[PDB]
Design a protein around this ligand. Structure first.
Ligand SMILES: NCCc1c[nH]c2ccc(O)cc12
Ligand SMILES: NCCc1c[nH]c2ccc(O)cc12
Lengths: 358, 354, 341, 355
């Protein structure tokens, strides 16, 4: 009389007992098969040490009660029932801090022989070890673990639905754009209490910061290099250097609010060095120009400085003596700046090597 | 007797069953989306935030009654009778009642603000044209269970912008739905409705803030040759130009969007013009330094002689070398500016014709 | 006696009973506001006051004031859009003779009409409304609501000048509350007005510079870059990506247009001066035009072209001074209209 | 424990114990974790707080004899809570939700919960970047007078003043002291209300700003000072001052974008940037005007008299002297402004450090 589907739903649910595990054989365990497909690394934070991701999470299992003969209920071999009305595995992430406002899937699929499936999108916010040095060419070994929250391995067992190799492959649903590129999802079974571990290794894309940090820094260093060719005994160089210092300060302000942060081998070369070298060069230029132009001859060049400078010139090689000492100091500063820029380029190439590519 | 009608509804239904008489007959979910606003299009994250007025309706076979028996449509509160499993397949981040009709039909309306995952290509910045999508699909049920169909005709939905709030940075061109059949097996086919929303960028602000200063900087840089002589007054001109350009590009790099694919096509010419300007400043400094106050190698003199021949006391030889190098630099400057103008015209033509 | 009283009043009163209210509102702080989305977000204290409970203290251990949970207990915004993350205060307050209280703060998210025309000297008039068929009233007289502003957090972007109520007729006897929030323009004294004034002054200085020199062209182009970066920067301060088009947004484009025109003039003139070869001389009609113009505001062909360029430059300078004076006059006018009212 | 909970809930919101005969009491402890963000524009201080409170109930009391051996966990929603709220509050924020409360067999209920408290506060930006801000968050009850619900401290005030170990101590702002102060709020409804005032003293780290704003500002000032070593006439300095001014404008736009924007007053340094702005513009105008003339004192009454009297405390003969005296006057003004900037910086740092 009643519709076949309605009668099936009644027969199954009105009797269904919310047992600890839906198994008639109470002693033996029941297997829960898991599968995780990554979709996007929405955000990664190094301050909060969290990793916001979107993963399509599907857990399979079989129930002893939710089985019926298709002979009755009009040859029906497939059914859908509300999630919370039945028992679902008590599987939780060992690491999650919060879960975002993912859509609420209310249905849990069932099959006539007792099989159950529960798909659900899952926007985790999990806390992991973030180590940002080698930026912008970073590689993160992020991972997360699934486990039975209260039950032990003797109650419910966790295993893959697909072979480990298939899970490891870079599945095609992922959004391969933007900062973070997914290398692999490497699963590992640890079986404490069943414990299933996925190793999500994500590699940053350095070209993302080609304009933000690479091009501006390279250009500022090159501009300072060409500026060093200007004579040191004129206000031309002073104006050039001070405007370049303003450029460096504006660059620092601009990146400080964008650069994910104290210390980073890219940023230990930028501003601890080039800003300090620029400031020292500007200070010495100001002092030399002021002293030479005032021409008061308040003091001659002291002997100790004379000997020290005539010794140091070998490394690179009365107002006129002051001009000469200023010039040789300027050449020494130019040599040091050349060394700094060479070290920067070497470091960038070395980092691009560890960030194996091409 | 609407309370009695509600009690009659509550007496039998349980939300776990598909409202259909024959389980073999798939439920048909009528769908329609109206684009209201495009809050943001984040190029770095590749997320198209947007606001959509989402409306759907499906038949409910068991929910039929005679209106006169209850004093003659009804609304039901939260914990509604049933709802399909339609999901926006590109969702990555984000009304409590439904309407019913006496003839066995249900209605649902929703203001839904989305954070959708899109494929953004910023090559043509600032004149971008995006082709973002929206894939509504049955997350769990198959084709045998739920089928999605457009409420309104595809022509009606393609051109419908009266609700769209034109104010913003982006412009709406279309919302073009097309039905597909996703198959994970011979059976178990899923029905998915794809609304390909197309949008453009409004380039006025970027034309006036990015393209105008860049074009004028290139033009005045070219002018640096003409009146300023080959030595002397040109050094300070180039110095000021370079110092202004450095800060301008610091800010531009702060402003231009970047993606894994790479920089916008326009962003290549800023770097080219910087290289040219730095080279010009260096060579002008060199000429000024040498002419005033070296071996002047003969092979270099022959090289420059061959170059000029193919283009179309020692200080004078230095001056001739400087003149030839300046002519070469002017030729390259003109070529670069012509290329920049041609690319701007091409990008604008593509953006407009779209 | 507390639990016995609770059970007694629970059994005595039903939710469905109203034969089948006084409101006091205090403003605390104004949250996000902007032209976009036309929403006013604020934090507000809402005190509510308005028989079955009516019980005698003597029969209940002389108890006089018993709190009750709000779960399934009956209690009495038109501009409503959202209520925000306000606390979920669960209890309610009752008195012995039936008097009931209910206090709870709200982070109201209400849609309102805002003008940006007078930005940043902007004074806005927004009103919240309270609104079963016909009654709602106020705890105090309308004039008393004004003094409540003294508790407002007044150091934010907006002042709160006055909160003034009114009564209407259930078309809930719609109660009106009119609140006047006056923008504080000293946020933008450094963000917006100071760079504008400085760029105008610097551009003024860069006009007595010789009109045929290289330094003139370098100065003008560097100022153009400065204007462009200023436009890029403040474009995030104002809600609109382009120029927001307040009355002051006009003067952010007039100056740039004049600077561009002056730059084009200067480059054209230097280009002509560089060409010492014979060239189209200044035709008689342009000579007459420039003669008439200069007469009303006050190496040969090259000299005449240079003079034409000079007079055109002085025309540009005159119009630019006029524009700057207009900008200053409008600024003082807006300050007067904002301060007076 | 299951049977204990069943019985406790079966025999069990309401006010716990005999208020008319004996007031109740709630104790609260505040642990400061991190100052996520302090907003100088909106005047809202965002902080992460670990909040603990306990109060003595009467219904949930039992003995180990009743159920085999002292502590139990019960759902948060079902049982009555002390109704404590922070008045200096704007938004809840995002923080973990805790489902279960703790209860001790003797009758003590313990509640732990961290909350991302977004508070409205009075920020004094005048001192920026050497900024010390006394920000207070207060706990009080409104539907319950002092008789209905008192409030007290979990531990001694000296401890909570000292306890800052859990603080991350990373970011822009430090944390100096979290010291409470109990006050009895008197209101018309009832002659006493109980409120717990917690004062939070934070402090900015000026290293980033010292090397981003102050260093280039001081260097621009000094470079301008040495600019006067160039001759007052001639175009060598005209190019110098032009380059300086063009750099200063682009620097200043970004600086203005950077500084905090409180209404009461812009930073005490923001005045000196404007002062040097004006001085540089005046110097540029002076040098351009001087070079314009030299390459004849028409109004001696205004021009000659002032220059003649100034030093007391044919273009070369007339104008060049005026140009030189103007240059020296402007140099003296520049020196005074730079000295004032230096003294203000030293004073601000002294105030910040002595805090
Ligand atoms: N989410 C698992 C089932 C499903 C529904 N729609 C899909 C689209 C693509 C895909 O790989 C899978 C699916
Ligand atoms: N009658 C309610 C008084 C009240 C509630 N919250 C408050 C906060 C502060 C204050 O002074 C007073 C109050």
């Amino acid at each position: 009389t009643q519709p076949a589907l309605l009668r099936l739903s009644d027969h199954l649910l009105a009797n269904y007992k919310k047992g600890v595990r839906p198994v008639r054989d109470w002693r033996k365990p029941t297997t829960v098969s898991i599968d995780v497909i990554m979709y996007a690394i929405l955000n990664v934070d190094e301050k909060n040490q969290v990793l916001t991701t979107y993963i399509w999470y599907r857990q399979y299992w079989t129930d002893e009660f939710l089985q019926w003969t298709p002979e009755d209920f009009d040859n029906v071999t497939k059914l859908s029932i509300p999630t919370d009305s039945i028992w679902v595995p008590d599987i939780l992430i060992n690491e999650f801090v919060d879960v975002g406002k993912s859509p609420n899937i209310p249905y849990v699929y069932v099959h006539h022989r007792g099989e159950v499936q529960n798909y659900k999108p899952l926007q985790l916010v999990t806390a992991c070890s973030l180590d940002i040095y080698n930026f912008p060419f970073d590689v993160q070994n992020c991972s997360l673990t699934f486990t039975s929250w209260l039950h032990t391995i003797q109650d419910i067992n966790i295993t893959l639905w697909r072979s480990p190799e298939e899970v490891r492959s870079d599945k095609s649903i992922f959004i391969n754009q933007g900062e973070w590129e997914l290398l692999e999802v490497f699963p590992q079974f640890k079986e404490f209490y069943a414990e299933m571990k996925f190793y999500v290794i994500i590699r940053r894309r350095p070209l993302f910061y080609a304009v933000s940090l690479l091009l501006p820094s390279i250009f500022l260093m090159v501009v300072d290099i060409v500026g060093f060719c200007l004579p040191p005994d004129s206000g031309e160089r002073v104006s050039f250097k001070i405007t370049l210092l303003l450029g460096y300060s504006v660059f620092l302000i601009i990146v400080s609010d964008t650069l994910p942060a104290i210390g980073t081998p890219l940023i230990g070369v930028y501003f601890v060095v080039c800003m300090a070298l620029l400031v020292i060069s500007l200070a010495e230029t100001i002092f030399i120009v002021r002293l030479v132009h005032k021409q008061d001859l308040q003091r001659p060049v002291p002997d100790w400085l004379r000997h020290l400078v005539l010794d140091r010139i070998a490394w690179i090689l009365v107002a006129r003596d002051w001009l000469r000492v200023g010039y040789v100091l300027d050449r020494l500063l130019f040599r040091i700046y050349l060394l700094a820029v060479l070290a920067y380029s070497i470091t960038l190439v070395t980092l691009w090597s560890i960030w194996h590519s091409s």
